[PDB]
Design a protein around this ligand. Structure first.
Ligand SMILES: N=C1N[C@H]2[C@H](COC(N)=O)NC(=N)N3CC[C@H](O)[C@]23N1
Ligand SMILES: N=C1N[C@H]2[C@H](COC(N)=O)NC(=N)N3CC[C@H](O)[C@]23N1
Ligand SMILES: N=C1N[C@H]2[C@H](COC(N)=O)NC(=N)N3CC[C@H](O)[C@]23N1
Ligand code: FES
Ligand code: FES
Ligand code: FES
Ligand SMILES: [Cl-]
Ligand SMILES: [Cl-]
Ligand SMILES: [Cl-]
Ligand SMILES: [Cl-]
Ligand SMILES: [Cl-]
Ligand SMILES: [Cl-]
Ligand SMILES: [Cl-]
Ligand SMILES: [Fe+3]
Ligand SMILES: [Fe+3]
Ligand SMILES: [Fe+3]
Lengths: 318, 326, 318
């Protein structure tokens, strides 16, 4: 991977736990690295997340099979244990496999029902999500959305609030209330925080959000009769491509789940129409030819660009 | 755009006027640039031609809407007046938009029912088409042909006459009458001219006399050709316009006028379409894509019947064209 | 072309003679060069192999037609004789074509029912195939296989024997017999030879093979008094793409032919599954994604990589 160290050392969601069943092999793609995810058939077995590559002759291990707590390459049958060490070369069954016979392994943790991966050296914890432990809140997951846009443009779009009346009219916006009041934004060691903001839907909700790290956002909305939170997680496939997922929790009736998912789906697809059209693909930082213009209601998206530059992000941006 | 200045400062057709209704938003591409063409809902409203790009967050303005004689970006609703100046930012409705909030605008003229665009500073006039105002002549437009070939190879193939008996058997030639007489070619202050040339066509109607077509053409600029043909009963002229999408891709259109019966329009359009598609089969195949000028594949060979296509290549070098050529 | 002179000056198969009937026009691609193959309508006419290019206005001659003993370009009807000389320019029927009016022609020989081409100046003869002349041997031909992999990776995969029990189980091995004996490998002026080797399916066969040149392999298998030999010929389309063909001869029953053809098709498709997945695309050579690992049963594929470097191959390898 050629991503910046600041990106390499963070945790990213790559899958839902429910999709990584015992005995299964699945794949993902993170910061330009192809990943294989596997579990032994044993109940409660851990998830291994490795680079999807057999170092013998360069075959994807995801093309193999899980047997007896090992992942077995399809080409010459080399067997790799849970730690990624080759323990058996069938052509030479009494030989001790060379030390180089070892899959590239990465850090993996399950949290909030999601599979989190760190390709580097974890310097931080997985982002917090306080309502996960609050049994007054129900939970639901959106499907995943594959987006042909930089992961930082994806997050930029979700920090933006002034677009609501124009592409989310009815759910998040009112074309008769397109004015945007003064925004409160802070960037510090807790990350990027937008203060409480009044949303007009054509009722009136109060919204705020925080990003402790650049590609995960915690979003909180209070309506009249209900509070809705979510954890937005962007998988940075590479500089130009993203996966998007939401874990949503709410303290109203359980029966609202389908309507919530439907509203999110409508809004997300409205945003994707814009995201797929933006040029340049990578997010421009502060300094397809004219440079970006910023107005006061861009205060939070300007702060996001400033934050990325302070962090040293060069991957997925321009 | 890496196009040469001599190309940037010229006029090119990007659309037919009749396909650009009031209130409409049309996309096109020219010399590597993405364009948006829009009109207000007022009748006889002019056509604006701008780079298709909102300078706020980089969204195509063509994804927006036309309202109150402005083009409105879909993302945050900034409204751009006919001059391309942002006159309204909805998030801050009492704020004067910054002077930088301005679309890149280009020159547009309507002429002969065609939308002409100049991306630079118009040195030249739009090419002349004398029959346009002659009521003895009817008019028709071909469809637009999208061609995966350099615009200069598209025009090279229209200047070429010796191919007629081989890929246009019937409408423009016959394979047993393939010899090419000496050609009159001039490159001068009027551009490139091929003088009157006898075209030998295959007979179709056995009751009638030979067609005995005499053709000539002139290019005052390198991607527009004025073509004139006298046949047995009538004169047919056309204006051929090549849109240089980029170095390797072209749109081709003809405006055709004739002083015979209006009822011939179907035969004319079908004959043009048959010939054009025969030419496209060759154009798509030619390598290198870009037109070789005079100087790993071997060099082009030239014979006497290539006099006008050689002259075209020499003219392009004189003009300084480097874009779409090699 | 950017291919090495050592590759340019060798012979490659580009077609089966059965693919090129009298009067036909066919295309092929070799070392980056587009080829046209044509024959006059006469009985037993020779095959011309030229660069697929009319030097007048750059049209592929393969879009033309064969007329008399000439290939006629579709655009302006220039006529090229069997030597590639333009003999008629129809616009100027009494004019002697300029000397430059000439197709680029290549060396071509038919041998073993295959069309061999040398783009350069051939320093070697076409490889030997002793059984061709033996009336005790029947012959058959596989179809041609277009493979999105380097021609040197295709040949590497056919030199590899330890993969037999894992991707060719039931034809060339089985997983209960995966151990690989000490291999006999020699590289000298004859090229690369693998000495006789036991193949499992007693239930066993004896195999050996030899490459006089890097992209053609002679292979010999004996089992139950029947012998099967083949000539494997790889067409190096460019650095990343190959055509694969086999000429097979055997001295058992004629009725084995469809079974032989079916077995080869299964094995080849089993190999293509692996070949298409391998990264990098080009064959990695030895060094003086992690680097390849080599174990004793890789002795002959290691020797292949060593040979290619010693020959100075840079095209299709890394
Ligand atoms: N973390 C985030 N979740 C999304 C949900 C969408 O809400 C609904 N109801 O669809 N809520 C919200 N205010 N936004 C604004 C940007 C993005 O759509 C999002 N950010
Ligand atoms: N400006 C041009 N219009 C075309 C028409 C086609 O006429 C018909 N009847 O199909 N006439 C003509 N002589 N040619 C030669 C090249 C190209 O097809 C063209 N040039
Ligand atoms: N020259 C070669 N021909 C092929 C045939 C395949 O045999 C069958 N029966 O399909 N025989 C053989 N031993 N191999 C090993 C590699 C490659 O499949 C091949 N090499
Ligand atoms: S490539 Fe994986 S065992 Fe050989
Ligand atoms: S991107 Fe056009 S108004 Fe914001
Ligand atoms: S391009 Fe082949 S004869 Fe003109
Ligand atoms: Cl297991
Ligand atoms: Cl729940
Ligand atoms: Cl961070
Ligand atoms: Cl993050
Ligand atoms: Cl309007
Ligand atoms: Cl305001
Ligand atoms: Cl050699
Ligand atoms: Fe949105
Ligand atoms: Fe033509
Ligand atoms: Fe194999």
């Amino acid at each position: 991977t050629t991503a910046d160290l600041i990106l390499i050392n963070n945790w990213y969601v790559v899958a839902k736990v429910e999709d990584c069943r015992p005995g299964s092999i699945t794949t993902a793609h993170l910061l330009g690295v192809k990943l294989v995810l596997w579990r032994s058939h044993e109940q409660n077995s851990p998830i291994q997340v490795w680079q999807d590559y057999c170092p013998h002759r360069g075959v994807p291990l995801s093309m193999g099979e899980v047997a007896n707590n090992t992942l077995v390459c399809p080409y010459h049958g080399w067997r790799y244990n849970q730690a990624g060490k080759c323990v058996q070369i069938p052509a030479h069954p009494d030989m001790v496999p060379p030390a180089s016979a070892q899959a590239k392994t990465y850090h993996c943790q399950e949290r909030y029902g999601l599979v989190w991966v760190c390709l580097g050296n974890p310097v931080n914890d997985i982002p917090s999500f306080p309502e996960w432990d609050d049994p007054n809140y129900h939970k639901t997951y959106t499907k995943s959305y594959l987006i042909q846009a930089s992961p930082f443009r994806v997050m930029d779009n979700s920090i933006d609030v002034s677009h609501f009346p124009f592409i989310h009219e009815g759910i998040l916006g009112d074309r008769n209330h397109a004015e945007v009041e003064d925004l409160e934004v802070k960037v510090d060691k807790d990350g990027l925080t937008m203060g409480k903001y009044q949303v007009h839907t054509s009722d009136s909700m109060v919204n705020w959000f925080r990003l402790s790290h650049p590609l995960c956002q915690y979003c909180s909305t209070e309506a009249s009769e209900m509070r809705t939170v979510d954890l937005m997680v962007v998988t940075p496939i590479d500089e130009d491509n993203s996966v998007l997922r939401y874990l949503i929790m709410w303290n109203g009736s359980k029966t609202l789940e389908s309507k919530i998912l439907a509203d999110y789906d409508q809004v997300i697809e409205e945003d994707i129409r814009i995201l797929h059209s933006q040029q340049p693909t990578r997010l421009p930082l502060l300094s397809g030819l004219p440079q970006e213009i910023h107005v006061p209601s861009d205060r939070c998206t300007v702060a996001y660009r400033r934050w990325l530059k302070e962090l040293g992000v060069t991957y997925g941006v321009c």
